[PDB]
């Protein structure tokens, strides 16, 4: 996240963090046995780290649990990130308290202008590399369709939507793909691609979760 600030310790309890021996993409937890991230995130040998803040340090509130299975959109295109949905199954499941705690799936896609909550252990930096070890939250709008296409001619679809400031300076990173997009208290996005981080004129481009309800409600009636 770069030009965000400091969540707090576990004020964003839905937020994961992808570990193939070290971190590489977020999720968000949907209840007590999966999570949902971006399909671009996908490798073999995940573990989900849960309740964490500082994910260089144990603090004490973390569940750390395998994947079992995982789940890539069936019409995800890596070259476009047209459906980049993933959905991770947790070998057992997480114990829900204050720390560790499922985002609702939207019944309804979010309005242009609406607020939204972005979160990650992604870069900091628009130019060079900075790591946080503790997670960043960044408040960002979403923009208007014709804002977005204008942005990125030719390479929106209707599986995604664009939030952020075209002026630039505020923006989700590399490192924090996969990782949730929450406004009025929905999952309404992944943390999905963009040009660069907090360019002018580039904001960043999100999974509309809207349209994967049905997906996502069937595949988990059924594994
Ligand atoms: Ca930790």
Redesign the pocket.
């Known amino acids: 996240i770069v030009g965000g600030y400091t969540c707090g310790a576990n004020t964003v309890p839905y937020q994961v963090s992808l570990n193939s021996g070290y971190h590489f993409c977020g999720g968000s937890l949907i209840n007590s046995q999966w999570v949902v991230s971006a399909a671009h995130c996908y490798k073999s040998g995940i573990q989900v780290?849960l309740g964490?803040?500082?994910?260089?340090?144990?603090?004490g509130?973390?569940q750390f649990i395998s994947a079992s299975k995982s789940i890539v959109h069936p019409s995800y295109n890596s070259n476009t990130l047209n459906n980049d949905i993933m959905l991770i199954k947790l070998k057992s499941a997480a114990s829900l308290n204050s720390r560790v705690a499922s985002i609702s799936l939207p019944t309804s896609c979010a309005s242009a202008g609406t607020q939204c909550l972005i979160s990650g252990w992604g870069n900091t930096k628009s130019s060079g590399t900075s790591y946080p070890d503790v997670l960043k939250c960044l408040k960002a709008p979403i923009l208007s369709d014709s804002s977005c296409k204008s942005a990125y001619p030719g390479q929106i679809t209707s599986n995604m939507f664009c939030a952020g400031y075209l002026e630039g300076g505020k923006d989700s990173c590399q490192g924090d793909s996969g990782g949730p997009v929450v406004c009025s208290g929905k999952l309404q996005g992944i943390v999905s691609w963009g040009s660069g981080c907090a360019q002018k004129n580039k904001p960043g481009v999100y999974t509309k979760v809207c349209n994967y309800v049905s997906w996502i409600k069937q595949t988990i009636a059924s594994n």
Not at 52 to 59: R, T
């Open positions: 780290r964490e803040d500082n994910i260089n340090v144990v603090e509130n973390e």
